[PDB]
Amino acid sequence: MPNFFIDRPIFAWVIAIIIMLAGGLAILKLPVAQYPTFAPPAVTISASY
Amino acid sequence: SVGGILRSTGRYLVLYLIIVVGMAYLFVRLPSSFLPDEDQGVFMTMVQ
Amino acid sequence: ERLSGNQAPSLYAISLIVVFLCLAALYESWSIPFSVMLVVPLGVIGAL
Amino acid sequence: VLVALILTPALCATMLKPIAKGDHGEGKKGFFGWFNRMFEKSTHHYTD
Ligand SMILES: CCCCCCCCCCCCO[C@@H]1O[C@H](CO)[C@@H](O[C@H]2O[C@H](CO)[C@@H](O)[C@H](O)[C@H]2O)[C@H](O)[C@H]1O
Ligand SMILES: CCCCCCCCCCCC
Ligand SMILES: CCCCCCCCCC
Ligand SMILES: CCCCCCCCCC
């Protein structure tokens, strides 16, 4: 594979640009937070007498 | 035919830009929609 | 309607770029891909 | 690793400057020369 892309430098650059393009687009559609949802979920039963 | 087309060359690049301008014209003029209203052999009438 | 709208130009821009890049890899040339990409208008003129 | 098997080799075989046999940057003018000498001297210490 290395010898393949030494003769084909444009092919090598093409794979790199497509990976970067996909990444650049992903940055725009990606959510932003401090943490993920890692805390355990809880369910409360509220009643009144 | 192509043999002689490859001799002229510059004539068809002027012909090409006319096709792009012609395409560009038609694209703008042609109205845009999403999905056409299909006849489904049924419809309704409101009475208010 | 207030939610998004007109996201076609943005996606057909990268569609063009990615098609050019894939062609450049096929021919191992930054220039030859253009000779293939310039037939796009020939099919659009017929449709319009 | 994929970058180091695809892109990195392609760049090393295109956009790298030819180095003459024996040249270890010990003749480089200024700070880089001192650092190159310090490392070459320190590599000898380390191996010993
Ligand atoms: C129809 C809408 C418009 C789109 C047209 C695009 C498709 C072209 C259709 C085929 C036309 C082929 O027409 C072809 O033209 C070339 C170039 O002028 C001619 O070539 C002629 O002129 C050239 C120079 O101008 C001479 O060097 C050559 O010896 C002579 O034969 C061919 O004799 C002819 O067969
Ligand atoms: C023949 C190889 C040409 C080298 C130049 C390629 C540079 C591409 C950079 C693109 C970054 C988005
Ligand atoms: C989309 C950004 C990359 C465009 C290709 C540039 C190629 C330069 C060849 C000299
Ligand atoms: C990174 C260079 C380290 C070389 C150490 C040599 C030790 C010498 C004997 C005390």
B27, C12 contact by CB (below 8 A) = no
Q: What's the length of chain C?
A: 48
Pocket of ligand 4 (CB under 6 A): D 42, 45-46
Q: What is the number of other CB atoms lying within 10 angstroms of the CB of residue B14?
A: 8
DSSP type of residue D10: H
Gap between the Cα atoms of D1 and C33, Å rounded? 29
Distances in Å between the alpha carbon of A49 and those of A9, A25, C3, C48?
A: 77, 55, 46, 73
CB contact set of C6 (below 8 Å; sequence gap of 6+)? none
Structure determination technique employed: X-ray
Instruction: Tell me, yes or no, if B27 comes closer than 8 A to chain C by beta carbon.
Output: yes
Instruction: Tell me, yes or no, if B23 comes closer than 8 A to chain C by beta carbon.
Output: yes
A17, D6 contact by CB (below 8 A) = no
D7, A1 contact by CB (below 8 A) = no
Gap between the Cα atoms of C30 and C37, Å rounded? 12
Contact call for B23 and C41, based on CB within 8 A: yes
C38, B16 contact by CB (below 8 A) = yes
Per the structure block, which two tokens stand in for D7? 């892109």
Q: How many angstroms is it from C37 CA to the middle of ligand 1?
A: 23
Which residues of chain B lie closer than 8 angstroms to C48, CB-CB? 23, 26-27, 30
Grouping H, G, I as helix, E, B as strand and the rest as coil, residue B20 is: helix
DSSP type of residue D29: S
Q: HSE of A16 in the Cβ direction (CA atoms, 13 Å)?
A: 16
Instruction: Tell me, yes or no, if A17 comes closer than 8 A to chain C by beta carbon.
Output: yes
D40, A39 contact by CB (below 8 A) = no
- The region, left, alpha or beta by phi > 0 then psi within -120 to 50, assigned to residue B44 is beta
